[PDB]
Write a protein that binds this ligand. Structure first.
Ligand code: F4U
Ligand code: ZN
Ligand code: ZN
Lengths: 109, 24
């Protein structure tokens, strides 16, 4: 449809293409390496739906300086979808966004 | 105390981490 969905669910809608934006100058979906070497092509979107947040936000290893991250999973199947990023300072724009990992989404980008 | 190397999800028990990790 209009939306990007949880690949495991196939049909649980997570965001819409209208929510994609460029935060990093590398673009709206760039490759990021986590502290264990795993590469996440991370699509940045303003808003997301049907996600559960796991745990407390953390700034350790954050790919977006000034933002903390919280693991986000599909609320229907519990598959990892990405992370919610929340600003640590009130003057930052946007104050929050979501980074969705490419392999967790359908259709295949 | 136990952390998924793929996504950063934290777990109190090693057994939940293992089930979670192999779901990736
Ligand atoms: O902005 C982000 C989001 C979280 C992500 N991350 C992970 O995927 C990860 C896995 C195991 C850890 O101990 C720590 C992290 C971590 O910070 C990362 O590197 N950067
Ligand atoms: Zn799902
Ligand atoms: Zn994980």
């Amino acid at each position: 449809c209009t939306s990007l969905c949880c690949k495991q669910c196939q049909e649980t809608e997570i965001t819409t293409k209208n929510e994609i934006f460029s935060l990093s100058l590398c673009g709206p979906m760039a490759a990021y390496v986590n502290p264990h070497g795993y590469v996440h092509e991370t699509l940045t979107v303003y808003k997301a739906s049907n996600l559960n947040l796991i745990g407390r936000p953390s700034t350790e290893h954050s790919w977006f300086p000034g933002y903390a991250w919280t693991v986000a999973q599909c609320k229907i199947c519990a598959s990892h979808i990405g992370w919610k990023f929340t600003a640590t300072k009130k003057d930052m724009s946007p104050q929050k966004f979501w980074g969705l990992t490419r392999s967790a989404l359908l259709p295949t980008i | 105390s136990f952390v998924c190397s793929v996504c950063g999800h934290r777990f109190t028990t090693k057994g939940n981490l293992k089930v979670h990790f192999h779901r990736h």
